[PDB]
Design a protein around this ligand. Structure first.
Ligand SMILES: *[C@@H]1O[C@H](CO)[C@@H](O[C@@H]2O[C@H](CO)[C@@H](O[C@@H]3O[C@H](CO[C@H]4O[C@H](CO)[C@@H](O)[C@H](O)[C@@H]4O)[C@@H](O)[C@H](O[C@H]4O[C@H](CO)[C@@H](O)[C@H](O)[C@@H]4O)[C@@H]3O[C@@H]3OC[C@@H](O)[C@H](O)[C@H]3O)[C@H](O)[C@H]2NC(C)=O)[C@H](O[C@@H]2O[C@@H](C)[C@@H](O)[C@@H](O)[C@@H]2O)[C@H]1NC(C)=O
Ligand SMILES: *[C@@H]1O[C@H](CO)[C@@H](O[C@@H]2O[C@H](CO)[C@@H](O[C@@H]3O[C@H](CO[C@H]4O[C@H](CO)[C@@H](O)[C@H](O)[C@@H]4O)[C@@H](O)[C@H](O[C@H]4O[C@H](CO)[C@@H](O)[C@H](O)[C@@H]4O)[C@@H]3O[C@@H]3OC[C@@H](O)[C@H](O)[C@H]3O)[C@H](O)[C@H]2NC(C)=O)[C@H](O[C@@H]2O[C@@H](C)[C@@H](O)[C@@H](O)[C@@H]2O)[C@H]1NC(C)=O
Ligand SMILES: *[C@@H]1O[C@H](CO)[C@@H](O[C@@H]2O[C@H](CO)[C@@H](O[C@@H]3O[C@H](CO)[C@@H](O)[C@H](O)[C@@H]3O[C@@H]3OC[C@@H](O)[C@H](O)[C@H]3O)[C@H](O)[C@H]2NC(C)=O)[C@H](O[C@@H]2O[C@@H](C)[C@@H](O)[C@@H](O)[C@@H]2O)[C@H]1NC(C)=O
Ligand SMILES: *[C@@H]1O[C@H](CO)[C@@H](O[C@@H]2O[C@H](CO)[C@@H](O[C@@H]3O[C@H](CO)[C@@H](O)[C@H](O)[C@@H]3O[C@@H]3OC[C@@H](O)[C@H](O)[C@H]3O)[C@H](O)[C@H]2NC(C)=O)[C@H](O[C@@H]2O[C@@H](C)[C@@H](O)[C@@H](O)[C@@H]2O)[C@H]1NC(C)=O
Ligand SMILES: *[C@@H]1O[C@H](CO)[C@@H](O[C@@H]2O[C@H](CO)[C@@H](O)[C@H](O)[C@H]2NC(C)=O)[C@H](O)[C@H]1NC(C)=O
Ligand SMILES: *[C@@H]1O[C@H](CO)[C@@H](O[C@@H]2O[C@H](CO)[C@@H](O)[C@H](O)[C@H]2NC(C)=O)[C@H](O)[C@H]1NC(C)=O
Ligand SMILES: *[C@@H]1O[C@H](CO)[C@@H](O[C@@H]2O[C@H](CO)[C@@H](O)[C@H](O)[C@H]2NC(C)=O)[C@H](O)[C@H]1NC(C)=O
Ligand SMILES: *[C@@H]1O[C@H](CO)[C@@H](O[C@@H]2O[C@H](CO)[C@@H](O)[C@H](O)[C@H]2NC(C)=O)[C@H](O)[C@H]1NC(C)=O
Ligand SMILES: *[C@@H]1O[C@H](CO)[C@@H](O[C@@H]2O[C@H](CO)[C@@H](O)[C@H](O)[C@H]2NC(C)=O)[C@H](O)[C@H]1NC(C)=O
Ligand SMILES: *[C@@H]1O[C@H](CO)[C@@H](O[C@@H]2O[C@H](CO)[C@@H](O)[C@H](O)[C@H]2NC(C)=O)[C@H](O)[C@H]1NC(C)=O
Ligand SMILES: *[C@@H]1O[C@H](CO)[C@@H](O[C@@H]2O[C@H](CO)[C@@H](O)[C@H](O)[C@H]2NC(C)=O)[C@H](O)[C@H]1NC(C)=O
Ligand SMILES: *[C@@H]1O[C@H](CO)[C@@H](O[C@@H]2O[C@H](CO)[C@@H](O)[C@H](O)[C@H]2NC(C)=O)[C@H](O)[C@H]1NC(C)=O
Ligand SMILES: CN(C)CCS/C(Cc1ccccc1)=N\OS(=O)(=O)O
Ligand SMILES: CN(C)CCS/C(Cc1ccccc1)=N\OS(=O)(=O)O
Ligand SMILES: *[C@@H]1O[C@H](CO)[C@@H](O)[C@H](O)[C@H]1NC(C)=O
Ligand SMILES: *[C@@H]1O[C@H](CO)[C@@H](O)[C@H](O)[C@H]1NC(C)=O
Ligand SMILES: *[C@@H]1O[C@H](CO)[C@@H](O)[C@H](O)[C@H]1NC(C)=O
Ligand SMILES: *[C@@H]1O[C@H](CO)[C@@H](O)[C@H](O)[C@H]1NC(C)=O
Ligand SMILES: *[C@@H]1O[C@H](CO)[C@@H](O)[C@H](O)[C@H]1NC(C)=O
Ligand SMILES: *[C@@H]1O[C@H](CO)[C@@H](O)[C@H](O)[C@H]1NC(C)=O
Ligand SMILES: *[C@@H]1O[C@H](CO)[C@@H](O)[C@H](O)[C@H]1NC(C)=O
Ligand SMILES: [Zn+2]
Lengths: 499, 499
């Protein structure tokens, strides 16, 4: 019988009590990264994250930091493999930068052979050390040309350009890569990129953020989300029809949260909690499992919600071999009005829910996750049981999928000095507490989870945050990025993996 | 009778001997800048200089510096006007960043109203202080989207996209701006951008530079040069046909050099000197004055040299109200082979000339201009009489044009400390020695020169060089770019202007 802790102090850092042998022998353990965040711009074309961080430097991070050099994994990829080798990792999730292999976006314009060679070297080096690559095709870094031609995922032209890029990736790398992820966190770009404009490309309605160059926060998230689903499904069909000989698997990446009622005896809060599940997860999972959006979304969003043709619905339904689930935290939900006529209306308001980390009785959900220096009342708190709740929900609601946990992690402040940053016991506590729950849900509920990839390998540029937060299991000195030195968390994870 | 000095020491820094009253009363004196070099990327789209400096950081400068923030004239434009006001300047040359007003390149995709407002504020502030703006439409910073769509000036599609951008500039600004420059230094982009790949977009033949993404150094400079002429002429025709009501003038910017024989009694060196004039100046000036390329170029370059149709020739011939002439230095010329079949053949070899600053008797042409730390034998030296020789040549060969000197200046090393950098007596010597010759040629030869704009207002990002050289009359501290403090040269120029 398995007992996991929910509140400080945790005792799961003791690898006598919890380690990789606690899981099935075939279970994959590793870490994750993404190309904009680690590589640098050397050797590639420009993408919308270059464009957004440079046009809107105060949106790049409080420090105006960006991915121009970052940890220089373009130069130092072998040091990344050395970290993974130190960990005795068996998996690594990384992303391919579209702008590194097709700098001009559209494949017919030419490929960058040196870009292709970069990834071939990485992949060969991973396999040589027994590490399974899990390769994300699109981790938000769209070639800027495509955004400038047709506004990227706002336009249906993206589908064929994405398809041709994916086709290249499978042709060049698929003899060695057997686990492909299509689009990172389906919910994020529509909402943050086209709703709040916190992320690239930075579009929104004028009174949401007057700095936005264009947009409509009420309509564009739904347009973009729909095109992401269609683009995803077209690539999954190409993979499964034309690359079956490679013997690999493909799926999307979801951002997952759990939701609990703000007041668990209030029917309105209970209803807002269930709406949130449909609006946050079901927006994509409904299409992926049924070929239709959730009914609550159909009813609420009305003419703003695009339709799938019969052909499209069939393409999108069942378009995954597995799901990559990212999980960080859980929120309480309460009702909130949805003022569809307000010039500052956003798609995110359609769920009719207000999200908090404190419930109506004043209970904070768990330990501190991310301090908000500007407003402490908006600190994020985590909830280790949430990973259990999410996985059980996916099994029960979404047809018992094969799952890999493709991100899970926690930041420490960039204001900390090196010693403080290396003594990242808060990161041990977060990671172990979630792995305890993950083990528990696999044993208790028989959820088909087959690996776990902690975010992140190393400190890197974090979207929105610059270098103001560190998420790495290994530390990077921004004055001299060559080394990646295992933190306390990295050392811990090494022992968890090989106890 | 006017005597000017050619060699150190100069005595023309004494404003009793040389000052603005030495020139005609209507003569314009000022300084120059360009948008990539001064503004920063805040508030604009990305261009090929962003793309090139980030893809090829070792080509951006030895320091890997770029125009991301630079002197932040986006924020600090009023400080630029304050420098000009301190100088009692009557002119200022600046450039409009295409990517700031039409971030998506093609006008039909939308305009950036905040970009437009930036320039309106600048222009209004200049006029309010009695400063004549001289506005460059294109100072090399092509929207990256256009380079990625069709390779920019390599393709005839540039002509209409450039025309529509220029049309916007004249519509929005032409009620106040009366002096327009089309393309900066016609020779430069073809040769450096498509020949040697020292500049954006960085194309060349594979054995010229294996880092280049694509190109052909033998053919593409001629293609690009031709499209620059056609694009220029289409914009001059639009201006003169649709914007005559504004009562302004338009022209191109040429880079000028003078050429002298390496051995002045050797007919082969004399011939190479005259070839150089045709290949460096005549490449563009032949079209601009006759509608045809020079015959020596027709004969040598053969099928690599594009033809003008009768319609095109008529469009390009006479396509200027004035010429903006940049002038920095003069070279000796000697013969050199032109191996048209060598896989490393470049267009620059077609002139059949090798260029030096030392003649066959071991005479260096003048004072030091730019040290080359990597190879001192390749130091650049200047030649004040060259400005006299160039202007006289333009009068005699090219039909007595109206001329404004749109750049002239000298760098000091970025390794210098602030005190050393402020004590820029070498810059006084350069500027005064050239203004003495300029006065001389106007009086002696009656060349129609009506103003002079020194490069540069302030220290900025220099193409290719990062922040390793300083050209400003005012000093900028890279740790805190707000202030622009007049150097000794700025102080001198203030007194030259108002003696
Ligand atoms: C998994 O995907 C399934 C689809 O493959 C989902 O089932 C579809 O659910 C649709 C609702 O979302 C449902 O559509 C409705 O269909 C009604 C029946 O139409 C037929 O029969 C009528 C009576 O004989 C006849 O008049 C018609 O001509 C049809 O033959 C139809 O009456 C509904 O239209 C009315 O209501 C709408 C909404 O208020 C009005 O706008 C409209 O004027 C009219 O008054 C409605 O049809 C749709 O209307 C909106 C329009 O945009 C659509 O194009 C049009 O289709 C459809 O029957 C079923 N299909 C099947 C095959 O069952 C399923 O949803 C779950 O199950 C259904 C039954 C329903 O209970 C949903 O709430 C459920 O969530 C998906 N599963 C999940 C978990 O998402
Ligand atoms: C200012 O622009 C002027 C144009 O508006 C320049 O003058 C043009 O200069 C052209 C040479 O660049 C010259 O073209 C040649 O024309 C020859 C005469 O053709 C007519 O008459 C013939 C005899 O009766 C007849 O057979 C023809 O059918 C024509 O009616 C022609 O023979 C030449 O072709 C021979 O030589 C070429 C080159 O070796 C061979 O390739 C070819 O097979 C043939 O053996 C040549 O014609 C051109 O050939 C190359 C081709 O790509 C061109 O399309 C075709 O035109 C043309 O006559 C004149 N035009 C005028 C109106 O005078 C002028 O150049 C200066 O002046 C001219 C005369 C010449 O001396 C040049 O060197 C000068 O620089 C320009 N000024 C400057 C300063 O650049
Ligand atoms: C979790 O949600 C539950 C259910 O909503 C909250 O319990 C409810 O709290 C309401 C007050 O917010 C109670 O209604 C009040 O009842 C008093 C006494 O009769 C009356 O004087 C008030 O005006 C009000 O009555 C409502 O007025 C508006 C009408 O539209 C509506 O019909 C009236 O009922 C309500 O009775 C109560 N429901 C139940 C089943 O207990 C609960 O709030 C917490 O517990 C209640 C018992 C009370 O102590 C609250 O102060 C306390 O906040 C909420 N829990 C938390 C922690 O917020
Ligand atoms: C500026 O250019 C002039 C003209 O080219 C240079 O003057 C020429 O220099 C040539 C040597 O580089 C002289 O030719 C030599 O003459 C001697 C004596 O007869 C002979 O023994 C040599 O082999 C050579 O003769 C040539 O061999 C190759 C044949 O294809 C050709 O037909 C032969 O002539 C040449 O006479 C001379 N011309 C004139 C008009 O004076 C000049 O070079 C400088 O001055 C000359 C006088 C001599 O002192 C050179 O050493 C000295 O460099 C050159 N100036 C500079 C500074 O380089
Ligand atoms: C977002 O786009 C939507 C849809 O084009 C706009 O909502 C329309 O608003 C107009 C004018 O108020 C109304 O006639 C329609 O009834 C609306 N259609 C729908 C489906 O709601 C909305 O105004 C745009 N928002 C902004 C800020 O531009
Ligand atoms: C962040 O930078 C943006 C420019 O990218 C600034 O956005 C201005 O935002 C204000 C406040 O809403 C508007 O009224 C202006 O119209 C915006 N200007 C532009 C050019 O978009 C913003 O001020 C900066 N934020 C902070 C906190 O300094
Ligand atoms: C706020 O959250 C707290 C903690 O989860 C809930 O308090 C638990 O409530 C259960 C059922 O009443 C009790 O058995 C536990 O003892 C409570 N735990 C603690 C730590 O107090 C609380 O009910 C939530 N409040 C609302 C309004 O939903
Ligand atoms: C790397 O991980 C592998 C696999 O867990 C380690 O090999 C296992 O080591 C345990 C404990 O010694 C043995 O029970 C198993 O028999 C080994 N399994 C296999 C398949 O070889 C290996 O020791 C770890 N390496 C390092 C350097 O920690
Ligand atoms: C530059 O482009 C030119 C023209 O396409 C190439 O020169 C041709 O070279 C081929 C193969 O040697 C020859 O058949 C033709 O005679 C040439 N045409 C001309 C006008 O010279 C040249 O090889 C390209 N250079 C590189 C480095 O790609
Ligand atoms: C400058 O950086 C470039 C990469 O942009 C390097 O160019 C390599 O150049 C060598 C030498 O010719 C070639 O053999 C390689 O094929 C090029 N690699 C790539 C990826 O283009 C160059 O080494 C760097 N220069 C210096 C002096 O360090
Ligand atoms: C190299 O340049 C020097 C300087 O301009 C030339 O020397 C001048 O030559 C003239 C004519 O012979 C003499 O009157 C001057 O006295 C010379 N000046 C000096 C400073 O020596 C020289 O002729 C050039 N050499 C060649 C081969 O062209
Ligand atoms: C700015 O420049 C103007 C013009 O040269 C200066 O005004 C001239 O000043 C001289 C010397 O005092 C007089 O001879 C002229 O009569 C003035 N000309 C005009 C048209 O007013 C002015 O003094 C300079 N200002 C500063 C602050 O130096
Ligand atoms: C660590 N980094 C790679 C995470 C990617 S974003 C994320 C999860 C999250 C959000 C806020 C703070 C930390 C993590 N959620 O995305 S969102 O759309 O739900 O906001
Ligand atoms: C100062 N900066 C704005 C100058 C622009 S470039 C220049 C002139 C030159 C070249 C080398 C060194 C200094 C100046 N010449 O361009 S070129 O094509 O002749 O090389
Ligand atoms: C691994 O943890 C299990 C409990 O899940 C424990 O029984 C086992 O001994 C641990 N292994 C090692 C080497 O400590
Ligand atoms: C498979 O590739 C073939 C060969 O190009 C192509 O014609 C076909 O449409 C592709 N099938 C897909 C994407 O399902
Ligand atoms: C949205 O607009 C409404 C109507 O003015 C306003 O009350 C509300 O505070 C606005 N929301 C935000 C987040 O600014
Ligand atoms: C950068 O760090 C590396 C790895 O520790 C070290 O070997 C190298 O000397 C460092 N460079 C500088 C300038 O300190
Ligand atoms: C300006 O220079 C001229 C010589 O060109 C001289 O005669 C005049 O006095 C100078 N003006 C002043 C104020 O020094
Ligand atoms: C002048 O503008 C008119 C109005 O658009 C246009 O039709 C015409 O072709 C332009 N003329 C030029 C570029 O010479
Ligand atoms: C150009 O190629 C030729 C032929 O190999 C060679 O001799 C020459 O040195 C090369 N030029 C440069 C600048 O590398
Ligand atoms: Zn940058």
């Amino acid at each position: 019988e398995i007992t996991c802790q929910e509140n400080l102090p945790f005792t799961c850092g003791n690898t006598d009590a919890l380690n990789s042998s606690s899981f099935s022998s075939d279970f994959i353990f590793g870490v994750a990264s993404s190309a904009y965040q680690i590589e640098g711009t050397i050797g590639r074309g420009l993408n919308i994250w270059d464009g957004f961080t440079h046009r809107y430097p105060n949106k790049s991070g409080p420090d105006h930091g960006n991915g121009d050099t970052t940890c220089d994994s373009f130069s130092y990829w072998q040091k990344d493999i050395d970290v993974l080798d130190e960990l005795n990792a068996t998996g690594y999730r990384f992303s391919i930068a579209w702008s590194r292999i097709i700098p001009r976006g559209k494949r017919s314009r030419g490929v960058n052979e040196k870009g292709i060679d970069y990834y071939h070297g990485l992949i060969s080096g991973l396999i040589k050390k027994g590490i399974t690559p899990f390769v994300t095709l699109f981790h938000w870094d769209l070639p800027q040309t495509l955004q400038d031609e047709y506004e990227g995922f706002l336009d249906p032209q993206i589908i064929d350009d994405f398809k041709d890029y994916a086709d290249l990736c499978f042709e060049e790398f698929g003899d060695s890569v057997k686990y492909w992820l299509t689009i990172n966190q389906l919910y994020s770009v529509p909402t943050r990129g086209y709703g709040s404009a916190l992320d690239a490309p930075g579009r929104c309605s004028p009174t949401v953020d007057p700095s936005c160059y264009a947009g409509n926060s009420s309509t564009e998230p739904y347009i973009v989300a729909h095109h992401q689903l269609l683009a995803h499904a077209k690539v999954v069909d190409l993979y499964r029809k034309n690359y079956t000989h490679q013997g690999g698997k493909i799926g999307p990446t979801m951002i997952t949260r759990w939701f609990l009622p703000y007041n668990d005896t209030d029917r309105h809060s209970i209803a807002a909690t269930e709406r949130m599940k449909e609006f946050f997860l079901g927006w994509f999972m409904g299409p992926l499992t049924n070929g239709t959006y959730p009914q609550i979304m159909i009813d609420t969003v009305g003419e703003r919600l695009p339709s799938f043709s019969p052909e499209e619905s069939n393409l999108v339904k069942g378009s995954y071999d597995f799901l990559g689930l990212n999980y960080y935290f859980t929120q309480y939900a309460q009702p909130s009005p949805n003022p569809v006529n307000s010039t500052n209306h956003t798609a995110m308001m359609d769920a009719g829910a207000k999200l908090t980390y404190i419930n109506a009785s004043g209970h904070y959900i768990g330990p501190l996750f991310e301090k908000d220096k500007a407003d402490s009342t908006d600190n994020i708190y985590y909830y280790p049981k949430g990973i259990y709740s999410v996985m059980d929900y996916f099994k029960n609601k979404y047809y018992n999928p094969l799952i890999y946990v493709t991100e899970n992690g926690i930041s420490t402040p960039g204001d900390e000095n090196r010693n403080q940053s290396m003594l990242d016991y808060t990161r041990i506590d977060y990671l172990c507490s979630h792995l305890c729950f993950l083990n528990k849900v696999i044993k208790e509920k028989d959820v088909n989870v087959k690996g776990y990839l902690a975010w992140a390998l190393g400190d890197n540029y974090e979207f929105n945050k610059g270098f103001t937060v560190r998420f790495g299991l290994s530390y990077i000195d921004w004055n001299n990025v060559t080394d990646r030195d295992l933190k306390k968390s990295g050392q811990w994870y090494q022992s968890f993996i090989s106890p």
